[PDB]
Design a binder for these strands. Structure first.
Lengths: 100, 37, 262, 143, 206
RNA sequence: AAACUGCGAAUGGCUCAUUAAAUCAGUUAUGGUUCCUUUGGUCGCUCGACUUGGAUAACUGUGGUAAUUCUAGAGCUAAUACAUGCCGACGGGCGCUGACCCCCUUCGCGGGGGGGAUGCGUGCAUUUAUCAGUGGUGACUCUAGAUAACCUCGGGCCGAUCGCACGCCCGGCGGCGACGACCCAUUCGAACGUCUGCCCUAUCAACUUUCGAUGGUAGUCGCCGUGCCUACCAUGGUGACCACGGGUGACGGGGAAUCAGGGUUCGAUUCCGGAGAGGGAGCCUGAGAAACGGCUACCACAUCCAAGGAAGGCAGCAGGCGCGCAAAUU
């Protein structure tokens, strides 16, 4: 799965913007590529499109389908999940605990 | 609290409705006295 | 301004607080509360300015946050709480109890009382309305909304309320002959029997008040409280008894006391 | 006479479609010791701004002035003459304000000269903050 | 933005003002809702003081009343017939306050027939063939039928209503402000109101 | 610690450019509105789960851009964030419905007087209509009551919240608070209205008006009152008691100087009120902003640049340049 990365001027991709160049977009809370400072702040940023060209720095790639081969950096070492569940219901679902 | 206050007012309001009816009936007894005077 | 003011300038402060004009730029802006800005005496001003327990405002923080100051029955940890008229300030560890009643000169006196007296206060009713299901509600001068009052209580009366419960005991009808503390205008702090309420429909109703020495004056109704039935008050009065002896009388009574006491 | 305008004309309070087998009129006392005229109670007209048969409430100030112009629909111009004290010269100057005032058709017998009494109410229009309360005809004018 | 300012306007005298201040917020205007007939699209606003206001943009149902004999029922609005504001807000099917609208009658007809037990509208010869409300025109005891007959002494309807009920389409007047409250409520026209508005429909139409 | 959350950042401070019935002042109104907060009410009133669901940040890891308080993908993980929702009180009332039923009168038909299952609906707030006229006003189309309905999916409430001290009770009951919450009231205001009051100018005498001028009627918009705005109307409105236009080295006032008594001049300047943040304009959030130590353009000016782009607003405190007769410490 191609999750999208950075333009070669550094500007991040924008999930579903449907161009191949950079757009100036009036971004807000609950958007990609924008963290607001004041409550309600709404700045105009440069974001690169979703159509992948030879005009990129880095693509972000998430491998869904596990294939034939082992691959030396990815699938060799496993890092265990740093934190376990905290909420009682999530612990109850994980360990398959009953409700008594 | 809502129940006790409601009853406690209802008894006080009842008492002041008897005071009001005694004042009413005195002024209508004064109408019967203005016919007698 | 594009929203509510949070400061109060010392020179803009109400005159009766008797803050100077050299300690700071600001006065304490009273916290929003039962009493108006221009009529309330904030707690800090009752602690560091009048009783003089504290020196600074950080001292008043160190007294009020220890949960000692109990303004009319309930502990207050707000240094700028608006304590106002008739409110009872109970400092428990000294065993002292104060009622905020106006001196005959505009300012609030420090008037100590018995703890037996401190258990009740007296509240002027502002208006009566009938609540959500025929329930008579009753708003006072310190906004103590009371549901199911006695039906013979009318708009401008007073009600002797018990602080530990918050229920009415007895009520004084606004009638001619009843005592009156005047709580506004030039006649602020004056005490006397109500003589003639003169009705002005659409305008303000003036109310004449005869003094104990016979020096009759008048006030706008809104500035008038009732403290007693006929001549007998339901509080303890501050010394002077709300007469306002004149500047000539004050002068020779200072001269007399200054020589006689020594 | 009435229902000249595009919309139907009725008092919003009184309901006139009770089932049968004259329209009853809503009116109120204005207060401040002013008698509502018989015309307001008797009348057939509808005026939302009338202080006897409309949605308007009279409070605050009660003024008076001589009627100047009765030109436009349901409102008049009064002219309030007063004497402004200039202190240097220890003298007065004759000034006047002429306010637009709404004139309810309960007052029909009004001539340009009659001393009209007016009461402050909510802004009816851009310039009008006064409805007429009573009319005293000019001193002598009967014939 | 779209402002509600007294100060942009010429003085009583005819002389024009200068602005001493720039446009304030509390002098909001907002664009007209211009609500239509159709399936419910009600947008919410946030207004002065953190309160809500319900922009109707499409609205069909309306809690209309039938004042003559007290009943009021949620009814489908079918047409805008007349507006005393503009002649265009009838052409452009825009619901506003004091619109004259054709609404359904069947909730009112079902009520009238389930209270007075009299077939209302309904041409002679044309029976109710499926046998639904033929059951609800008969089948009482002694003293319940007596109660209905004592009540039936006061069941004469007007000639205009009786004609409108036949088409299944009453004329009603919007008393709500759909742009503000988000409801298309009101009352059914009766008497000299309905005579006036039927003459105005007849005046513009023909 | 960090981070999410909450609250504040709309106060304070500065300056006086604009503004001449405006601002402002005294004086009323809000029975025409809005209001975070505090304060007091209210918070089993609706008759119909021993606690639920999906995240996301901090953290770890992989980065990209010359550059920003730029941020991307990945792996976890909370809530008084974001949603979702019961049990209880709770058993029954009260309105219609109306099967059924008992009695009294008429020999009988009929007329009355009682119980009556099932079903419908039900509280406060919402919107519309109708009826009667608890407490209140100088006056309400007030508050409260009754009826009939409605109740927005961009959604009113009815507590899935957290702490101290622990108890009583053959598992059930409770204390002291914290936070939350619809609505009423209160405080803090704000907003728009009433009355009266302003410097010079006539080499400014007629002005305003179918690109709203004054008014009517009905809407739209707005927190609400209003030509605020639309549509159709009517032809108004103001002026020699100086309108209208122009000017002002004009923010208004409390005040200042001078001073026999009258006056004259000043008030940018520490308190009140207003206005603006280089000039105009538009708006997000919020109780409150048309905010600028917020954002979005345009205009003017100007910074950084690997020349692709990014960042700016001292009429805050210092300080610098410039301007000047003229004003202080980074």
């Amino acid at each position: 799965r191609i999750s999208g990365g950075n333009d070669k001027q550094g500007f991040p991709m924008k999930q579903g913007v449907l161009t191949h160049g950079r757009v100036r977009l009036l971004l807000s809370k609950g958007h990609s590529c924008y963290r607001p400072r004041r409550t309600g702040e709404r700045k105009r940023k440069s974001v690169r499109g979703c159509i992948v060209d030879a005009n990129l720095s880095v693509l972000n790639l998430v491998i869904v389908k596990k294939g034939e081969k082992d691959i030396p950096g990815l699938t060799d070492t496993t890092v265990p999940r740093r934190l376990g569940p905290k909420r009682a219901s999530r612990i109850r679902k994980l360990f398959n605990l009953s409700k008594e | 609290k809502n129940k006790e206050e409601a009853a406690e007012y209802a008894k006080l309001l009842a008492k002041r409705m008897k005071e009001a009816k005694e004042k009413r009936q005195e002024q209508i007894a004064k109408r019967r006295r203005l016919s007698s005077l | 301004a594009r929203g509510p003011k949070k400061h109060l300038k010392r020179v803009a402060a109400p005159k009766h607080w008797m803050l100077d004009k050299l300690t700071s730029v600001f006065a304490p802006r009273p916290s929003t509360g039962p009493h108006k800005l221009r009529e309330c005496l904030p707690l800090i001003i009752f602690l560091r300015n009048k009783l003089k327990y504290a020196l600074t405002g950080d001292e008043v923080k160190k007294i009020c946050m220890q949960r000692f100051i109990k303004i009319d029955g309930k502990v207050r940890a707000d240094i700028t709480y608006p304590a106002g008229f008739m409110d009872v300030i109970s400092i428990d560890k000294t065993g002292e109890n104060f009622r905020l009643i106006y001196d005959t000169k505009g300012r609030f006196a420090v008037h100590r009382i018995t703890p037996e007296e401190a258990k009740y206060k007296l509240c002027k009713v502002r208006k009566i309305f009938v609540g959500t299901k025929g329930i008579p509600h009753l708003v006072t001068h310190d906004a103590r909304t009371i549901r199911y009052p006695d039906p013979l209580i009318k708009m401008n009366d007073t009600i002797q309320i018990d602080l530990e419960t918050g229920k009415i005991t007895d009520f004084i009808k606004f009638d001619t002959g009843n005592l009156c503390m005047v709580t506004g205008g030039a006649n602020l702090g004056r005490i006397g029997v109500i003589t003639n309420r003169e009705r002005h429909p659409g305008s303000f109703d003036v109310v004449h008040v005869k003094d104990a020495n016979g020096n009759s004056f008048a006030t706008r109704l809104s500035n008038i409280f009732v403290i007693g039935k006929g001549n007998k008050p339901w509080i303890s009065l501050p010394r002077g008894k709300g007469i306002r002896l004149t500047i000539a009388e004050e002068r020779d009574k200072r001269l007399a006391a200054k020589q006689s006491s020594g | 006479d009435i229902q000249t305008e595009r919309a139907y004309q009725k008092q919003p309070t009184i309901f006139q479609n009770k089932k049968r087998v004259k329209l009853p009129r809503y009116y109120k006392n204005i207060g401040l010791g002013f008698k509502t005229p018989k015309e307001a109670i008797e009348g057939t007209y509808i005026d939302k701004k009338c202080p006897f048969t409309g949605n308007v409430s009279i409070r605050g100030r009660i003024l008076s002035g001589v009627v100047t112009k009765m030109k436009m629909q349901r409102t008049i111009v009064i002219r309030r003459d007063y004497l402004h004290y200039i202190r240097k010269y220890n003298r007065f100057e004759k000034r006047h304000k002429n306010m637009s005032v709404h004139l309810s058709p309960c007052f029909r017998d009004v001539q340009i000269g009659d001393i009209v009494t007016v009461g402050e109410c909510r802004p009816l229009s851009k310039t009008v903050r006064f409805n007429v309360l009573k009319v005293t005809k000019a001193a002598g004018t009967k014939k | 933005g779209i402002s509600r300012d007294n100060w942009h306007k010429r003085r009583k005298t005819g002389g024009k003002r200068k602005p001493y201040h720039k446009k304030r917020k509390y002098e909001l205007g907002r664009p007209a809702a211009n609500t239509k007939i159709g399936p419910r699209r009600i947008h919410t606003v946030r207004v002065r003081g953190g309160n809500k206001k319900y922009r109707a943009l499409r609205l069909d149902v309306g809690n209309f009343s039938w004042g003559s004999e007290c009943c009021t029922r949620k009814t489908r609005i079918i047409d805008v017939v007349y507006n005393a504001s503009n002649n265009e807000l009838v052409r452009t099917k825009t619901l506003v306050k004091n619109c004259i609208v054709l609404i359904d009658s069947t909730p009112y007809r079902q009520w009238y027939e389930s209270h007075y037990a009299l077939p209302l509208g309904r041409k002679k010869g044309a029976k109710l063939t499926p046998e639904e409300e033929e059951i609800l025109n008969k089948k009482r005891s002694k003293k319940i039928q007596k109660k209905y007959d004592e009540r039936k002494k006061n069941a004469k309807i007007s000639s205009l209503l009786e004609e409108q009920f036949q088409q299944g389409k009453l004329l009603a007047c919007i008393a709500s402000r759909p742009g503000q409250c988000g409801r298309a409520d009101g009352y059914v026209l009766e008497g000299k109101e309905l005579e006036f508005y039927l003459r105005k429909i007849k005046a513009r139409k023909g």
